[PDB]
Amino acid sequence: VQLQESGGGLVQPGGSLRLSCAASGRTFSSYNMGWFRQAPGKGREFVASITSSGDKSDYTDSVKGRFTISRDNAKNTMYLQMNNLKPEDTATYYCARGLGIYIIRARGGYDHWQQGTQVTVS
């Protein structure tokens, strides 16, 4: 296991949830880290990602202004703060990471994947 997700569960529409993703401190700040999500019968949609240093981040259009990705390199933990949650956001959320040489938007850059956490908006 390279990545361990926390957070998830049930949320009311308009509510908030924080996801987190931990990895080893040895190499933590060498990797971009992001979140993808998957609804049954569909593919893995990019949600957000953040560069190794935390200086750059990006988001899929439908979550801009609602979700914020951040990382605490000191604590070896990355976060997705999900605010104003909507039915469209129900999915399994996967933490992913890839070497910092990749641009964060490159799907092909994500080497490691967590097991996923289910988020259901009531």
Numbering used by the authors: 2 to 123
Q: What did the article's authors report about this structure?
A:
Prion disease is caused by the misfolding of normal prion protein (PrPC) to its pathogenic isoform, termed PrPSc. The host-encoded PrPC is a cell surface glycosylphosphatidylinositol (GPI)-anchored glycoprotein containing a flexible N-terminal fragment and a well-folded α-helical C-terminus. We recently reported that an anti-PrP camelid heavy chain antibody or nanobody (Nb), namely Nb484, inhibits prion conversion in cultured mouse neuronal cells in a dose-dependent manner. To understand the structural basis of Nb484 mediated inhibition, here we report two new X-ray crystal structures of mouse (Mo) PrP•Nb484 complexes at pH 6.0 and pH 8.0 resolved with a resolution of 2.1 Å and 1.2 Å, respectively; and the crystal structure of the nanobody Nb484 alone (at 1.2 Å resolution).
We also crystallized Nb484 alone and solved its structure to a high resolution (1.2 Å) by X-ray crystallography. Nb484 contains three complementarity determining regions (CDRs), each noncontiguous with the others (termed CDR1, CDR2, CDR3). These regions account for the specificity of the antibody for a particular antigenic determinant. Remarkably, the structure of the free Nb484 changes in the CDR3 from the same nanobody in complex with the MoPrP. More specifically, the orientation of the CDR3 changes upon binding with the MoPrP, thus interacting with β0-β1 loop and β2-α2 loop. The B-factors indicate that the CDR3 of the Nb484 is significantly more rigid in the MoPrP•Nb484 complex as compared to the nanobody alone. Specifically, Ile102 and Tyr103 of the Nb484 undergo major structural rearrangement towards Gly123 and stabilize the β0-β1 loop of MoPrP. In addition, Arg106 stabilizes α2 of MoPrP by binding to Asn174, His177 and Asp178, while Ala107 stabilizes the β2-α2 loop of MoPrP by binding to Gln168 and Tyr169. It thus appears that Nb484 undergoes structural changes in the CDR3 to enable a greater complementarity between the nanobody and MoPrP.
